[PDB]
Amino acid sequence: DSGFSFGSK
Amino acid sequence: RLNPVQLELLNKLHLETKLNAEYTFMLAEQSNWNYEVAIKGFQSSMNGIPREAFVQF
């Protein structure tokens, strides 16, 4: 899976 | 693929956030490949990352 995000984009 | 530099970063990333390489990479990209932000990156969202991405870290 994907679409995940980390550092406040 | 990837540049030995970015790769090494993944290692530090998988050795600092240890949130699973594949995912860690997701961070190496979602973090602009900075590092400091990468790390913080993991420590950033830390509210959606699954148990698959977050392996004991």
Side-chain angles (χ1 to χ4, degrees), chain B residues 29-46:
Chain B
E29 58 176 285
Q30 275 147 200
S31 66
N32 336 296
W33 301 82
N34 199 330
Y35 174 64
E36 193 185 14
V37 104
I39 346 299
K40 252 183 273 163
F42 158 48
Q43 328 292 12
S44 188
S45 276
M46 191 66 258

Side-chain angles (χ1 to χ4, degrees), chain A residues 1-8, chain B residues 19 23 27 30 41 44-45 49:
Chain A
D1 53 273
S2 177
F4 178 91
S5 311
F6 283 101
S8 308
Chain B
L19 59 87
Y23 296 78
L27 205 148
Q30 275 147 200
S44 188
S45 276
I49 1 186

Side-chain angles (χ1 to χ4, degrees), chain B:
Chain B
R1 47 163 164 273
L2 197 61
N3 219 104
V5 218
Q6 353 199 232
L7 178 285
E8 283 287 271
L9 154 57
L10 305 193
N11 310 165
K12 260 263 63 176
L13 220 71
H14 181 257
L15 272 278
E16 195 157 16
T17 134
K18 251 192 163 56
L19 59 87
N20 194 9
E22 293 284 295
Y23 296 78
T24 228
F25 144 82
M26 225 198 308
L27 205 148
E29 58 176 285
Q30 275 147 200
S31 66
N32 336 296
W33 301 82
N34 199 330
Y35 174 64
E36 193 185 14
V37 104
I39 346 299
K40 252 183 273 163
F42 158 48
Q43 328 292 12
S44 188
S45 276
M46 191 66 258
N47 196 228
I49 1 186
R51 305 166 288 119
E52 320 181 338
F54 122 65
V55 285
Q56 280 287 140
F57 273 72

